[PDB]
Amino acid sequence: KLPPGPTPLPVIGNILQIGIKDISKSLTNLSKVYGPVFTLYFGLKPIVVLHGYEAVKEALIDLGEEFSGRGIFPLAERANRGFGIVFSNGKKWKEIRRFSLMTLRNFGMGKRSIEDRVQEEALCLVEELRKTKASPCDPTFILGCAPCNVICSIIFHKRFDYKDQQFLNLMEKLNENIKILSSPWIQICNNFSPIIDYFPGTHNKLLKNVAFMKSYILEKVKEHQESMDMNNPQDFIDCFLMKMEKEKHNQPSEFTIESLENTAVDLFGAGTETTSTTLRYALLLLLKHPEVTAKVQEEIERVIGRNRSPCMQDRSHMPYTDAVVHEVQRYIDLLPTSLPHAVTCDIKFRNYLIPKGTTILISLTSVLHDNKEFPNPEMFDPHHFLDEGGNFKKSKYFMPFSAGKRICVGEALAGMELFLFLTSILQNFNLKSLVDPKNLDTTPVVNGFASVPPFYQLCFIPI
Numbered sequence: 510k511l512p513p514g515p516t517p518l519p520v521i522g523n524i525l526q527i528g529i530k531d532i533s534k535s536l537t538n539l540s541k542v543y544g545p546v547f548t549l550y551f552g553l554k555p556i557v558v559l560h561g562y563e564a565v566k567e568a569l570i571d572l573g574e575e576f577s578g579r580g581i582f583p584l585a586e587r588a589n590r591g592f593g594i595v596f597s598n599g600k601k602w603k604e605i606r607r608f609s610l611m612t613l614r615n616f617g618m619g620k621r622s623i624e625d626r627v628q629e630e631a632l633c634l635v636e637e638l639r640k641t642k643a644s645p646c647d648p649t650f651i652l653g654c655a656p657c658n659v660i661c662s663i664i665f666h667k668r669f670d671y672k673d674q675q676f677l678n679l680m681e682k683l684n685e686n687i688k689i690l691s692s693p694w695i696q697i698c699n700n701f702s703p704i705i706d707y708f709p710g711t712h713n714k715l716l717k718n719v720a721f722m723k724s725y726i727l728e729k730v731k732e733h734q735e736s737m738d739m740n741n742p743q744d745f746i747d748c749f750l751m752k753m754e755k756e757k758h759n760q761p762s763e764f765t766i767e768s769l770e771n772t773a774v775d776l777f778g779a780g781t782e783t784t785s786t787t788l789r790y791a792l793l794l795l796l797k798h799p800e801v802t803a804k805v806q807e808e809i810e811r812v813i814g815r816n817r818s819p820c821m822q823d824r825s826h827m828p829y830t831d832a833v834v835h836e837v838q839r840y841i842d843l844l845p846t847s848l849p850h851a852v853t854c855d856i857k858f859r860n861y862l863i864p865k866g867t868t869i870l871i872s873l874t875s876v877l878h879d880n881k882e883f884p885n886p887e888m889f890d891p892h893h894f895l896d897e898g899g900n901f902k903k904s905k906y907f908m909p910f911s912a913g914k915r916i917c918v919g920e921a922l923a924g925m926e927l928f929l930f931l932t933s934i935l936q937n938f939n940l941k942s943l944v945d946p947k948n949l950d951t952t953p954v955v956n957g958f959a960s961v962p963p964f965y966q967l968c969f970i971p972i
């Protein structure tokens with residue numbers, strides 16, 4: 510048997526029960542009726558939902574290889590998304606992921622470290638924030654540039670100047686695509702149609718934007734082929750090309766110029782928006798909780814001071830800051846259902862039998878907002894990651910990057926970006942709201958499978 514669920518209607522399954530508006534809350538409501546493991550029907554396609562820590566851990570961690578598949582919907586083929594890391598499966602995924610992890614280690618791309626790349630972006634970020642000259646400002650665009658340029662640095666070896674038109678084009682395309690991809694028409698409703706694409710225009714626009722990106726990446730690969738130093742790979746492209754020229758006696762290979770372009774599009778896609786949104790949300794929460802900000806600044810001033818950049822090494826001496834970043838991620842819950850999984854083979858889970866390829870939906874909300882691990886889980890409070898002594902308290906329930914075999918490839922990178930960008934900002938600025946802090950609402954705007962902060966402005970007042 511599959512896990513029990515609400516009985517589907519004919520030809521529409523469970524669609525009309527589920528509140529598309531806030532899918533996570535519906536899943537949670539269902540869990541109160543059917544328990545931690547239950548089945549929903551998306552017009553005949555069964556979806557098993559895992560809710561709560563135990564179920565999620567059992568599946569993602571203890572039965573990891575079996576739950577390592579990526580769930581497929583029509584959108585995957587309509588936006589040509591299954592050829593990188595994020596939406597790939599089997600051998601293509603294993604190989605590209607493995608390689609990408611090796612390449613993305615702090616020193617996996619020559620002498621220049623990933624941390625160096627992030628540190629340079631943090632100085633640039635601070636500078637743009639000075640240029641606002643302490644006036645009101647929607648930080649959206651500035652905070653989005655920093656992570657985008659980090660990926661640029663990782664892939665092409667060199668960051669762009671924030672005004673370089675080639676950068677502004679990449680960024681604009683990416684924004685467009687992500688905003689389109691956020692629409693419930695594109696994420697949900699159009700997947701109800703298994704064969705006919707009811708938004709052919711939209712997908713065309715998506716693909717055109719991709720092609721622009723892929724074509725820019727091709728220009729660079731060429732440049733990288735004409736300046737290849739086999740002993741000194743400096744970026745993700747070099748590393749990929751060396752992997753190719755190491756596989757030439759083994760075709761057909763998962764490593765080709767085409768998988769390089771698709772993998773890089775994945776890294777831009779995965780690596781920008783979520784980090785950007787997390788940073789923006791962090792500043793909103795810091796505005797609203799100025800005591801919190803002050804405690805971070807106390808750590809900064811005491812451990813780091815003013816005569817130098819904040820580096821990772823600092824993080825182990827700054828538990829309060831570490832707790833603040835962790836708590837931002839836990840509270841805001843940007844991917845409440847992760848990305849969909851799928852079982853790779855027939856598998857007995859608990860006392861249910863789940864057939865190979867069945868889509869699994871993991872509720873990360875249920876873990877991050879566990880009300881016993883994180884009492885008052887609905888409140889932002891850095892103490893959720895602090896012991897009674899004021900030290901950092903780890904949580905097995907801290908899964909904003911998901912868990913198991915499909916855990917975010919950028920976990921460590923996003924971790925550096927968040928810590929270095931936040932510390933560098935509060936090293937150099939205080940934060941002043943336009944409106945009254947008591948009047949700001951930090952509660953998240955959900956629209957489908959995606960959380961987002963509300964709109965706000967602030968002033969970056971130099972110290």
Ligand code: HEM
Nearest residue numbers: 594595779780783784844847848910911915917918919923
């Ligand atoms: C705070 C920022 C980020 C968050 C919260 C985040 C979170 C996630 C989550 C939840 C997943 C899905 C895991 C799953 O399928 O179960 C994921 C996948 C991924 N993330 Fe991130 N991510 C972030 C930043 C980044 C960055 C900076 C990169 C850049 C390398 C990146 C690369 C990826 C990739 C490649 C995947 C696909 C992994 C796979 O399916 O095998 N992410 N991320």
Ligand SMILES: CCCCc1nc(Cl)c(CO)n1Cc1ccc(-c2ccccc2-c2nn[nH]n2)cc1
Nearest residue numbers: 689694706707708709710711712713714715717718
């Ligand atoms: C039809 C093939 C042309 C594809 C295309 N490439 C780009 Cl670039 C544009 C800019 O709008 N477009 C057109 C486009 C037209 C309508 C939409 C759209 C916007 C809101 C709601 C539904 C649609 C839609 N897409 N397809 N049909 N209707 C999106 C892109």
Ligand SMILES: CCCCc1nc(Cl)c(CO)n1Cc1ccc(-c2ccccc2-c2nn[nH]n2)cc1
Nearest residue numbers: 588590595682683686690715718722774775778779
């Ligand atoms: C100009 C190119 C912009 C990026 C982009 N446009 C499209 Cl279309 C693709 C499809 O993969 N992509 C790549 C992409 C890959 C993964 C994601 C992603 C990664 C982690 C978590 C959620 C997402 C997601 N899926 N849909 N929207 N955002 C977003 C975009």
Ligand SMILES: OC[C@H]1O[C@](O)(CO)[C@@H](O)[C@@H]1O
Nearest residue numbers: 551552553554700701702703
């Ligand atoms: O597999 C059964 C098929 O039925 C559909 O739900 C149609 O709603 C598709 O999403 C799925 O592919």
Ligand SMILES: [K+]
Nearest residue numbers: 708709710711
């Ligand atoms: K049209």
